[model samples]
Target: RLPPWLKKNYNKLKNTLRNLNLHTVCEEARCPNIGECWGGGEYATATATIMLMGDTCTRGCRFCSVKTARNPPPLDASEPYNTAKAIAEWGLDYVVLTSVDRDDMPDGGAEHIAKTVSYLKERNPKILVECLTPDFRGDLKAIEKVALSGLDVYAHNVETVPELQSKVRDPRANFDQSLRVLKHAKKVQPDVISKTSIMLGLGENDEQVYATMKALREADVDCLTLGQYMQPTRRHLKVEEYITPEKFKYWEKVGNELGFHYTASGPLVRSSYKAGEFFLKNLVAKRK
Candidate 1:
């Protein structure tokens, strides 16, 4: 059973996405906040996180609900332009562009990701673009490629504390590699805000959580998001615990004191949740 706070009204944004032949992490990953994030009910803006590459991820992490394939379908050459056209028509003020891990590609699909960001910016320069990217197999060059693509915020999730990385993430993913990716994004473009997320209830301790937050701040991460981890399926890792709303509030306060520009903390908060969109919009505008 879901907590009361997780309940939300439905929206037609999924239909719009289907019409555009686009896929979103919200639908692909079965995000709990899909309705509220997709302009349902009282939420005024229509926001969606576009998943690039394909529906199949090359890496199989323990907590993810996304499907996987060693060799997924070949890249769709028309996807970049098609995605841009769809979002441009929506008149969205902010857009998040993300992709599945494509280890099969030599550059790990960095070029493809960069091209999508480029096309989107070309279509509507006013849209504030945020790229919630993969680690690119810890390739600094790949990180630099996306950092230089005129994105407002470059985000990558650390996902969990260092202690739980090996258990929760794919074998290739590690805490140090993820931290390096975040650090390198800041180094590549100091002006582009670097962000990452952490999911609680993965059997991490209070001391470990605090240490992870400090490490992210040390990496010069500008934004942070903390959310409760829910079991995606019986095949995936079980949730060690259900963190309370009060605990989420406590972490938000802790992150603020530690110097993160913003921390979106809640049970239903995902990496690209809508609550942080307006705040990011104002932050980028002020920076401009």
Candidate 2:
């Protein structure tokens, strides 16, 4: 059973996306906060996170709901232009651009991802572009490309604690690799805010959680998000425990004390949740 805050207005955002011919992680991954995040009626912020490249992921992570295929489809040459045009017309204050793992590509789709971010910046220079990106298979050049691509936030989710990396993520993804990606992004562009997320309730102990947080801080990650991991389907990993809201509050305090500029912690919080965007919008302003 979901808590009251997680309840959402399902259709308005779905209809909006359908009209735009856009794909969102909110819909692709069945995010619980889709309705509120998409903004309908009383919640009319109109913020959105757009998925780039293509719908099929190259790697299969146990907890993910996004479709996977080794060789899914060729990149749409018009995606960068089309995505930029849509967001420019909407005139959103903040926009997040993410993508499926195109590991089949030589650069793991970094150029494509960077191009999309660049196009958005070109069309509307005022809009904040936050990229929730893949690890790029530990490619520093790929990481560098996106880091310097005129994006406000360079985000990569560690997904889980180091101990559970093998079970929760794909074979190509590891804890150290993710940390390196975040760390290298900072190294490439010090001003670019590096962010990462962790999904709780995966049977991780408090000690492991703290260790993961510490590791991210050491890598110079500026922001952190802690959210409950709800299983998207029966085929995905089952929920080991539904963490309480009190615990989420406790972690938020801990994250701030540990030196993160911001932390969004809650059962319904996601890597690209709206509250984080609100906080980040101000942070990006100050940094400019």
Candidate 3:
């Protein structure tokens, strides 16, 4: 049961987000813990999901609802400034800048992503920005352009295990390419926090999950999030299993033991859900 404090705060947060013309995985993905995070002011208060590069994603992942089509509208040049303005108005200490996959465009919309990150920082220098990005069609140069754009953290979700990559994501998206993007981001920006997340219950095994975590660590990823995958619709992937709270706890313990500097393991974790506050607080404690 969600605490009363959380319920009240979540309503406030919901209204705030709605007024801002923003989108969030909390609402779009139908996350179970939306009340708990958005209400409790633990992680949700520090950041918002600023969906850029238009709302239409070219790739229709079974688990996502950001709209997928053959051709999404062109990049909105005003998006960077408007997003930065919203972050500044909220006075967010951390912000998540993400967009739908833009495979239809060359460079996979990397330039727009870089411009947004740069513009946000320019407007609010104190805000620690994180980008949950697409695979950029495996273009290392495009990935590098965003990496060097001075964001505090860079994240790209592997989304699922290696075997499910093609089935779960678009045909153009590949597991090795996603890994390479994370690895290359770390190589380009050593000081930036490199993070990635994976959803469980997509027919993945313990061995496979651990292997993915190890791969991220080898690629120098500093943080990881493990979440349960719920079907966005009857057409999407079914929830093959329901991971219990205890199981999530066990996964968190195992992830910590495996050397992830930070891990949020639960049935409802998403790539941007509660990411900023949790990471910032823990990362600071680690320094002390």
Candidate 4:
């Protein structure tokens, strides 16, 4: 049996986002900490990942479960405003707006993400937003379009160490391309926090993981997240290892020492974990 708190928040969230025709990476990705991080369970701190554009993703990576399509549904023009209205009404201190990979779109749905951020921030200046966004196939202009938008943080996942990039990510999404995107984000707006996520396991070696961290730091990524890769299905990539708590703790120390402002690392840590925000809210407040 599941906890009542989890069920209540899940349903409440579904009903609320459903009304606006909105989506969240929480429900779509089957994130393990959905209940705990939804401000309902023990943590009691609010954080959620809003999926902009649509749920229909154009790329199919080995580890993701979001629906795939060569050409999915058309973009909803009202998504920006509707997302803004619902989020403003919710009154969360920090919100994460992420989306599916839209290879079909001319600019990879960058404008849609920007519009939603613009509306939400405009509605309530008190809210802080972080966008876990796509790489725009390594296009600097597209990356800049969203980076320059009024978001406090811009995040994209490197997904894994470069050695396993071929097995872990889409062909078009590679290490160098992801680096270019992150670097360009910092280049465009030095003030915005540049972030990325790396999923551990998947058979990567220790040195490879360290090298990947070195590369991200060289690109000036300000924050990092590391989570164990859980297999979504038998058809998906199998987990190569169950990393220990000590291991995650070690990595957290390494990440911070490597110059990240903050690092969220754990077995159940998702990209949008609320713990990061506790540190970030204060950090961002002091940035200005």
Candidate 5:
């Protein structure tokens, strides 16, 4: 059962978010613990906030439920202002900005991510911005542009272990390339909190998981999130297994042991799950 505090906050969040027409990973990805995370009436809310930028994705990942189509609508010119307004209105201390992969865009929406962060900071300087971003097709210039946007946390999920990359993600989304993105961000701005996530139960062994964790550490990521891979639809990836809560705890311990400053491991944890709270509890007060 979820704690009482979590439940109260979840309900408040549900009412608040529903009125905003907001889209979150909790809703879009159909995360299992949306109730406990967003519905748990706790002061601590763990909504996987996913701001679906662009209309749809160019590449369809099997584990994702987001619609995929070619040549989606152009970026909403007022979206940056609206997103910041929503964050300020929600009184969210930490805000994560993520969007669908816009492979069709020249910079792959990096500039838009930066613009959103800037708008939020201009409105609420105290609110920390965490951007879960796309690969930009390994373009370092685009990566640097977003990193320098004064974002508190720059996160990009590697998605899965190296060997399982193609099976789980598109052929263009390679593990080494993802590592390079994180590494490049670290090199460009060491002070910025670098982060990445991985989905478990994707047919990877324990050793492979450890290797992926080690690789992220090597790339200088400050945080890690581990979650169970749930199939989005019958047409999408099939559920190989339902990871137990105990196993999730075990992985959480492993990440801490591996030197991650902040780690959230659970059946319901996702890239943006409880993201704001996690940073508040772990990062310094100045950034929070």
Candidate 6:
């Protein structure tokens, strides 16, 4: 039973994105809260994550359904301009920029993502950009490149608790590798807000979840988002549990106790969820 409100801005945004030849993780990743996040239909504001580079990811994570190719198409040189042009006109206060893992590229498409944000900020100086990026295969140089770009919040998802890294993420990504990426993101850009996300219901227990939070904090990452893992397809990882709303509430409290600058946790939450909404905007601006 789809809610009528969900369709309000969907077609409008889809037309615009399609016209620009763009891809959004909201659509490609099958994010459940797209209706709420895409604005319109009483929500009034919008947050859309523009996927840069291309759709085919190099690494095949078991949990992800994004198409995979050992060598995806070469980078579109015109993409940076087109992306910036698309976002500049939308007039959104916040935008999340992300991409597939371009392991085939030397810098993992870091400069391409960075260049897009740089151009975006140049055109719309007031907008707050959040970049949810790849781990860059643990290359400190790649992390530094994107962190130095003009963005307000720099994000990378740990995706799951440490124990499930081998089971959940691609073989290339591990617990310590993700931690280094976040830690170095903060190190390179001391002022920017560093953020990460974790998926609940991925066979992670409470203590394991806490340790995940604890490790993120120790990395000096500022914002955290916890969301349930809804299976993209029956072929992907099956949902270990459909975590209750109450347990998510408990995790929110635990995040505060451990001192995350801000934590958004619940059934329908996503990394780019409600990014420009009042509280997070204010917190980001306070730090800005």
Q: TM-score for model 6?
A: 0.90
The sequence of per-residue lDDT tens digits that candidate 4 reaches over residues 102-220 is 99988999999999999998899887788889999987778989998899889999999988989998897999999999888989999898888999879998899899999899899
**lDDT preference between candidates 2 and 4, better one:** 2
lDDT of 1 at 188: 89
What is candidate 2's lDDT per residue for 1-288, written digit by digit as tens?
A: 866544533465555456675666666666667666665423345566888888789999999888999998999999998988877776566678989998898899899989988998988898878899999999999999999999988999999999999999999999999999999989999999888889998999999999889888888899999998888889999889888899999999999899998888998888878843445443643432
Candidate 5 segments exceeding 4 Å error: 1-7, 18-23, 28-30, 34-48, 285-288
Whole-model lDDT per candidate: 0.83, 0.83, 0.78, 0.81, 0.79, 0.83
Q: Per-prediction RMSD in angstroms?
A: 2.8, 3.1, 3.4, 4.0, 3.7, 3.4
User: Tens-digit lDDT track for model 1 on 1-288?
Assistant: 877765522335555455665666667666777766766523345666888898899999999877999999999999988888888876565688988899998888888989988998988898778899999989989999999999988999999999999999999999999999989988989899888989998999999999999999888998999998888789999989888899999999999899988888989888888833545443543432
Give the runs in model 3 whose Cα sits over 4 Å from its true position: 1-25, 28-31, 42-44, 286-288
* lDDT accuracy of residue 225 in candidate 5: 94
Error of 2 at 142 (Å): 0.7
User: How much does candidate 2 score in TM-score?
Assistant: 0.90
How displaced is residue 122 in candidate 4, in Å? 0.6
Q: Write the per-residue lDDT of candidate 3 for residues 68-158, one digit (tens) a residue.
A: 7888888888887777777676556667788888888789888888988888788878788899888898899989999999998999989
Best by TM-score: 1
- Counting clashing residue pairs in each candidate, in order, gives 0, 0, 1, 0, 13, 0
TM-score for each candidate, following the candidate numbering? 0.91, 0.90, 0.89, 0.89, 0.89, 0.90
Better of 2 and 5 by TM-score: 2
Candidate 6 C-alpha lDDT tens digits along 1-288: 222322256566666666555567777767767777766423346788888888899998888888899989999999988888888776565789988999999999999999998998889898789999999999999999999997898899899998999999999999899989988988888888888899988899988988889888888988899987877788999888877888889999998899987888888888888876633443734443
Q: lDDT of model 3 at residue 80?
A: 76
